[PDB]
Design a protein around this ligand. Structure first.
Ligand SMILES: O=C(c1c(F)ccc(NS(=O)(=O)N2CC[C@H](F)C2)c1F)c1c[nH]c2ncc(-c3cnc(C4CC4)nc3)cc12
Lengths: 228, 290, 229
């Protein structure tokens, strides 16, 4: 196979949906140890996000019904919900193992180092909602280790206004709030990230001027929603 | 604004061409959607091919006096409001004109012939009528309290899911009436009442002879009272609630979306809030432009 | 009437997992007995949605071919990927039609089932037409023409111009000649004739009838506007 060959195929599966093949295309790029450019990196992150995007939406509605069934139906609907989450666990196991075993070991550049770790935290956060007890604690803890480790490199080599660095700023802040129920602990953390970007707005460029503000509005909308 | 590819199922419509939308674009900002063919006219503001088949998922007259009438409940434009009881729980309106005119006398026969078939769920079911001493109309009594009383007298604020579902069931009412070629003038919460389980019942649709965009306009003010008990609406609620109200209150008639589209749209507005009820994540990069 | 599976199909539609819905609803037909309108109504919803993705997917891919001229290795893969869809799409058409002609129609009793089942068989043959070309296309379309004929035979005698099933037939059957035989005027008179009857059946309005009646008629009227323009 060829890298230029598969890039074209991905740019077609990016159309007409069928994200399952699109993810399978990017996976074959990894196994040869080839590094990904800035654009080659986006497709892998874009494709895998949507595949797990469907399951989470399906799970949330199904759980709502099961907690609203009060009785053989309640037995049946509960059985169906446990089936969906089993599919989710397969995807997260595949994706992070692909990073840990192949992509992360070859990571050299500073910006790419941030991106690999940020994906590690996010694709562990989704596993937390299924988990309960010490399983939830470990998943919360383990994802926090990667999240915390990722934040280290952010301050050393990245500007206060970097789209990838700000990307980790939003998710890691949410992780403490949504899952670990530490609102102000997360709110104080998220509040720091917002001021960094607005501090040196002049440093932006037309390539990412609005791109950075894409997260900034979300942070502001997160801030307003959390403040009340 | 950023846009992504999407295929729509059930029922969905364009926002510019305002016609059926099966496969088109959707905006993560303000939920804006449009066809590719109609994308040529879409601004930055917030070889056509045919379609096919979409999946879908005189004995009434009663004498006078026998009814054990109750206290006056209200005062209408063309009658007096009362509740009675005659072999069942009903309510009777005491109309104005003491001596019926010959024009409305025969029209009374046909008005009964028209109202005898309108049997919608979210409307107060017709039960009877009378004209023996004077014109009168019998309407089913609501086994509870009306809509206006609930939200203004002895305040009992409802669930937002219940609040929108009330509007959803309210939408089911007026839409069917327009399919009967009926245009309404007095559509307001002053004529809307709540039945068992506070289910919405709409009356004041009688007198087809004695007495749509304007109806939507009236319907727009009704839904305003729900979410208010424009910017005063809850921010935590889906932003598409504001968009639905904005279009329904346009001054131009045809610019206001018609009732058939709103029923599908209201279903959409009742899905985003439960599906996404949490702090927002991160949106990815846009991959479209014009 | 094994509601154990019936509720499962309901869940999948709520869960949007239409792949799951088809498999269970298929087993409903394995009972052999006649099915209620609701039990039958779902089957049309599920397989329609699965085919809905392919017709969306196939047309976009084929649009890239006959486009981006001046490239060899680009279009080589594109042809393979396009014809990769067809084998998948032919599975559904082969599977579904292998189910209608065996179970549902041979056991259907009333005009409600007989008209509905024949109309469904005709519609799925229409989607098979876009793929093949020439005699291969001819070998399929000539099969569907008799289907929309016999379906239109019983429906004239039995059920009214307001019946929900018959009215839908007035829509697609008009498109059949319009997009596979290319006879606008021939299709123009056929559907517009049934449109007037629906207006004549206004007195037959029902809470079930009014939704479908206007919905198809609105879209039925739209076709006249764009076609004759
Ligand atoms: O006021 C009317 C009425 C009327 F006087 C005249 C006409 C019509 N409509 S109609 O006849 O034109 N129309 C066409 C066919 C069908 F008849 C409907 C009416 F609806 C009611 C009819 N039934 C009701 N039940 C309950 C209440 C009520 C209860 N509680 C409270 C507050 C204490 C909480 N307020 C009000 C009011 C009515």
């Amino acid at each position: 196979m060829d890298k230029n060959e598969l890039v074209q195929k991905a740019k077609l599966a990016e159309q007409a949906e069928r994200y399952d093949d699109m993810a399978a295309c990017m996976k074959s790029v990894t196994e040869q140890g080839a590094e990904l450019s800035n654009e080659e990196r986006n497709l892998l992150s874009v494709a895998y996000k949507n595949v797990v995007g469907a399951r989470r939406s399906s799970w949330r509605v199904v759980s709502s019904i099961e907690q609203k069934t009060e009785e053989k139906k309640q037995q049946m609907a509960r059985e169906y919900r446990e089936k969906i989450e089993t599919e989710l666990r397969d995807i997260c196991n595949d994706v992070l193992s692909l990073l840990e075993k192949f992509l992360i070991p070859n990571a050299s550049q500073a910006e790419s180092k941030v991106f690999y770790l940020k994906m590690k935290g996010d694709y562990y956060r989704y596993l937390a909602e299924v988990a309960a007890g010490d399983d939830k604690k470990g998943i919360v803890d383990q994802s926090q280790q990667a999240y915390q480790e990722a934040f280290e490199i952010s301050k050393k080599e990245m500007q206060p206004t970097h789209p990838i660095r700000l990307g980790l700023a939003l998710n890691f802040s949410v992780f403490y709030y949504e899952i670990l129920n530490s609102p102000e602990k997360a709110c104080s953390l998220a509040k720091t990230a917002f001021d960094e970007a607005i501090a040196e707005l002049d440093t932006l460029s037309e390539e990412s001027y609005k791109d950075s503000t894409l997260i900034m509005q979300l942070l502001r909308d997160n801030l307003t929603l959390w403040t009340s | 604004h950023n846009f992504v590819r999407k295929t729509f199922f059930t029922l969905a419509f364009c926002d510019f061409c305002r016609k059926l939308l099966f496969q088109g674009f959707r905006c993560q900002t303000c939920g804006y959607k449009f066809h590719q063919r109609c994308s040529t006219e879409v601004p930055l503001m917030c070889r056509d091919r045919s379609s096919s088949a979409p999946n879908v998922h005189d004995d009434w007259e009663i004498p006078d006096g026998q009814i054990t009438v109750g206290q006056r409940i209200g005062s209408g434009s063309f009658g007096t409001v009362y509740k009675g009881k005659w072999h069942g729980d009903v309510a009777v309106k005491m109309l104005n004109v003491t001596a019926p005119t010959p024009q409305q006398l025969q029209a009374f026969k046909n008005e009964v012939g028209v109202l005898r078939k309108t049997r919608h769920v979210n409307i107060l079911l017709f039960m009877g009528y009378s004209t023996k001493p004077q014109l009168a109309i019998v309407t089913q009594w609501c086994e509870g309290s009306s809509l206006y009383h609930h939200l203004h007298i002895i305040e009992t604020k409802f669930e937002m899911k219940k609040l929108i579902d009330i509007a959803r069931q309210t939408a089911q009412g007026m839409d069917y009436l327009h399919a009967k070629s009926i245009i309404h003038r007095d559509l307001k919460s002053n004529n809307i009442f709540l039945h068992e389980d506070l289910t919405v019942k709409i009356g004041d649709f009688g007198l087809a002879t004695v007495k749509f965009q304007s109806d939507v306009y009236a319907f727009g003010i009704v839904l305003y009272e729900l979410m208010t008990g424009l910017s005063k609406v809850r921010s935590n609620c889906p932003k598409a609630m504001k968009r639905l109200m904005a279009e329904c209150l346009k001054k131009k008639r045809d610019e206001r979306p018609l009732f058939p589209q709103i029923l599908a749209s209201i279903e959409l507005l009742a899905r985003s809030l439960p599906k996404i009820h949490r702090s927002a994540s991160e949106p990815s990069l846009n991959r479209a432009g014009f």
